[PDB]
Design an enzyme around this catalytic site. Sequence first.
Site: not given
Ligand SMILES: CC(=O)N[C@@H]1[C@@H](O)[C@H](O[C@@H]2O[C@H](CO)[C@@H](O[C@@H]3O[C@H](CO)[C@@H](O[C@@H]4O[C@H](CO)[C@@H](O)[C@H](O)[C@H]4NC(C)=O)[C@H](O)[C@H]3NC(C)=O)[C@H](O)[C@H]2NC(C)=O)[C@@H](CO)O[C@H]1O
Length: 130
Positions: A35, A46, A49, A51, A53, A60
């Site tokens: 990372e 990014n 979108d 956002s 990191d 993120n």
């Molecule tokens: C273009 C690119 O690659 N960009 C990179 C980022 O994508 C990446 O960060 C990660 O982004 C993902 C995608 O959205 C994110 O995933 C989401 O995470 C949330 C939080 O956990 C999920 O939501 C939860 O879902 C559960 C399911 O029921 C619930 O219990 C809870 O209530 C939900 N909370 C929310 C707020 O919705 C999303 O489901 C999930 N989405 C998907 C599609 O999976 C990751 O958390 C991000 N990771 C990090 C570490 O931040 C980034 C990371 O380095 O890199 C960018 O370059």
Amino acid sequence: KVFERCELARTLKRLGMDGYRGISLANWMCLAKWESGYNTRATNYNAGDRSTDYGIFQINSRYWCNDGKTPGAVNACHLSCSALLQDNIADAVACAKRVVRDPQGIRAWVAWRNRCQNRDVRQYVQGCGV
Ligand SMILES: CC(=O)N[C@@H]1[C@@H](O)[C@H](O[C@@H]2O[C@H](CO)[C@@H](O[C@@H]3O[C@H](CO)[C@@H](O[C@@H]4O[C@H](CO)[C@@H](O)[C@H](O)[C@H]4NC(C)=O)[C@H](O)[C@H]3NC(C)=O)[C@H](O)[C@H]2NC(C)=O)[C@@H](CO)O[C@H]1O
Ligand SMILES: [Cl-]
Ligand SMILES: [Cl-]
């Protein structure tokens, strides 16, 4: 700050990351390496979108910390994103622990799937005394 490999491994072990929510220390090491190259001041915007990191684990802003400028975001770690750019990684570790408490666990980082999953990750902790 840019940590040296073994210096980070010993730091993460003291902070309780070895086996946290089932994730071995080597997996956390592999993640930090790909990372940010173990760099706490790393940031990646990014344009697609609006956002950003932040820090050693590239956490993120859409879900985990507040930077104010990301639309429709939440702040599940309860931190300003500035907290993830400090040389002291205690806040970043507390946040990373929060990230993996959600269902995807370590899969929250796509870099982990690409670079670490199903690989021999012992290399990241070899000879560090952990
Ligand atoms: C273009 C690119 O690659 N960009 C990179 C980022 O994508 C990446 O960060 C990660 O982004 C993902 C995608 O959205 C994110 O995933 C989401 O995470 C949330 C939080 O956990 C999920 O939501 C939860 O879902 C559960 C399911 O029921 C619930 O219990 C809870 O209530 C939900 N909370 C929310 C707020 O919705 C999303 O489901 C999930 N989405 C998907 C599609 O999976 C990751 O958390 C991000 N990771 C990090 C570490 O931040 C980034 C990371 O380095 O890199 C960018 O370059
Ligand atoms: Cl804060
Ligand atoms: Cl804030």
